[PDB]
Amino acid sequence: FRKMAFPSGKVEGCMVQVTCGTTTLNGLWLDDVVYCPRHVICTSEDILNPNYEDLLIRKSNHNFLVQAGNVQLRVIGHSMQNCVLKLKVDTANPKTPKYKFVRIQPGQTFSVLACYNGSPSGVYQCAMRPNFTIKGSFLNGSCGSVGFNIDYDCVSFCYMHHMELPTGVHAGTDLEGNFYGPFVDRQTAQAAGTDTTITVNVLAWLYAAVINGDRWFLNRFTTTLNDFNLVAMKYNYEPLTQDHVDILGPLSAQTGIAVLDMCASLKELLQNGMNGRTILGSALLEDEFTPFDVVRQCS
Amino acid sequence: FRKMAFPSGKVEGCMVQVTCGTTTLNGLWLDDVVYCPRHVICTSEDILNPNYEDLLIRKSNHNFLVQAGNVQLRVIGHSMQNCVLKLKVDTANPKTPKYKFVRIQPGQTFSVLACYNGSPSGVYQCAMRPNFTIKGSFLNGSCGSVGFNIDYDCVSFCYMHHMELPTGVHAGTDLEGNFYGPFVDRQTAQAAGTDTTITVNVLAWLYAAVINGDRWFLNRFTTTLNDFNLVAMKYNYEPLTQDHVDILGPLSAQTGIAVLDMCASLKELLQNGMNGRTILGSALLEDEFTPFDVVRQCS
Ligand SMILES: COc1cccc2[nH]c(C(=O)N[C@@H](CC(C)C)C(=O)N[C@@H](C[C@@H]3CCNC3=O)C(=O)COP(=O)(O)O)cc12
Ligand SMILES: COc1cccc2[nH]c(C(=O)N[C@@H](CC(C)C)C(=O)N[C@@H](C[C@@H]3CCNC3=O)C(=O)COP(=O)(O)O)cc12
């Protein structure tokens, strides 16, 4: 049981390279539109406090150079939706999969296709933390890389990458240009709210540990939902809802461990620690696996 | 720092399914040849102790159903190479990338595209252990899934999946059909050799830490290679090779820390312990990042 990303071929066929002036980043080419972060129009001066509608009315179609591999697409239009620039081109991408723009909830996961200069570099799995950051791996030139899920040949795009906080975590927008969290596309050191642990995902990952024949953390005891949430909130874990309990049903049915039983296990793990032992190789409680993540891998 | 797979699109376009009787597994379609595990020709009463040579003589080209999606590709030739079947087909795969077949060393990492009935399911990075096993995530129907590295648009295929040992780790061959490690393609419980820690990768991980300003573990001593290797084996660490010293070159030059000085630093860490202090946020030493992996995620 490992962190597993969706195959990235369908998104790879859409990554292009967008240049305005002296700056370059990645864009997403679907049908005849290219989507990219709008601060690609900005200069070193502008970046500190950009008045984007002002900067954009002064740009022309010919100020944008879009490259798909070695061929250049001609831009025939440009508009701005929140933080994303939409560049119309005179060519439809034949590799455009069935797709949808969606806004992810905190706790949900997606695959990130890291790109540099319109070339895909790597793929890995991330979760939207409760404080609307993600713990990614991105360098200079990765802006415009997207996050996505795949559901029966439909690619749901949910993330476009914009910045790296001083603490080394990452921030970005949905494909409608709206940031996840309180961040802004201006060149400033920004801080996020206090992060908390995704409780439903820790539980799913304990269930995963048992599906793979590991059980040392189990115990005989049980807890009520409310009493687990009291201890949980004490340790900066998100609350567990009855919806979460329902979602975990399959995992409980498969292993024969009721949810509130597994909660009693996690409570004791929080109150006492791991005592040097490890779960699925990890020395810390993992919270970047959704219950759907677990079932899809184990079956 | 994240475990990061290569983008999987060039390999996705090469995945097909190969059916003999009622057993279906995955195959790899490059130019006009399909590669797959030979035990696809086995019946459930044959897998215990197959006579592959005798089994193959009774097979004809029309006993083999090769499908890209639900589209059939006609088999026009067949032959066996160690444990892989090679099926010549009547169509050259137009999505064939520039490619190589290569045999990796323990410690090297690679990306696995987990496939079922010729359809990609997921992608993740594995390291080849010193006992020639990989810590995979595979279900029934996964045999013939391949592992690969991509360097400058050329795909180097290094693994084809065959087996899950009773301990839950996995085993397979290179693309010429030679098993990694002492295993055989028969339906029997086989045991891996005792595993050890991949020393070259731990050192890579120490260089990563230094690059990020975490360097308390650096010391004023050096060692000879042989002296380090003798000590390393007493701690269940792999001995260093001359090639290992060579692939630490870039990290050594970038940090100004000589390889044998970093060995002396690691050697003190083995004799004395971490004393509660951490490295890159952790109390255990990571051994599944290669020196190329570190260079990739730092630059
Ligand atoms: C003084 O201000 C600061 C103080 C302290 C911390 C700070 N952090 C940022 C920031 O992150 N700024 C965004 C651009 C703003 C305008 C939204 C950025 O730099 N994004 C990168 C991806 C980043 C690059 C490194 N790792 C990534 O993930 C692009 O890809 C585009 O820029 P490039 O063309 O590649 O250089 C500003 C800042
Ligand atoms: C009774 O003997 C045993 C005792 C104890 C442990 C044992 N383990 C194996 C084994 O692994 N046997 C190979 C068959 C070959 C080696 C002849 C196999 O089962 N390979 C799977 C991949 C596996 C499936 C689950 N997770 C994977 O990685 C395929 O994909 C092909 O088989 P399928 O037709 O797809 O089911 C036999 C065995």
Author numbering:
A (entry chain B), B (entry chain A): 3 to 301
Please quote the paper that reports this structure.
Mpro is able to cleave the bio-synthesized viral polyprotein 1ab (pp1ab) at 11 specific sites to produce a variety of mature non-structural proteins necessary for viral replication and transcription. In the current study, we expressed six Mpro mutants (G15S, K90R, M49I, S46F, V186F, and Y54C) that have been identified in Omicron variants including the recently emerged XBB.1.16 subvariant and solved the crystal structures of PF-07304814 bound to Mpro mutants.
The prepared samples were successfully crystallized and the crystal structures of PF-07304814 in complex with these Mpro mutants were solved to 2.29-Å (G15S), 1.95-Å (S46F), 2.05-Å (M49I), 1.75-Å (Y54C), 1.97-Å (K90R), and 1.70-Å (V186F) resolution, respectively. All these complex structures are in space group P1211, which is different with that (P212121) of wild-type Mpro-PF07304814 complex. Two of these mutations (G15S and K90R) are distal to the substrate binding site of SARS-CoV-2 Mpro, while the other four mutations (M49I, S46F, V186F, and Y54C) are located in or nearby the substrate binding site. Similar with that in wild-type Mpro-PF-07304814 interface, a C-S covalent bond is formed between the HMK warhead of PF-07304814 and the active-site cysteine (Cys145) in Mpro mutants and a tetrahedral carbinol complex is generated. One obvious difference is that a water-mediated hydrogen bond with Thr26 can not be found in the interfaces of mutant Mpro-PF-07304814 complexes.
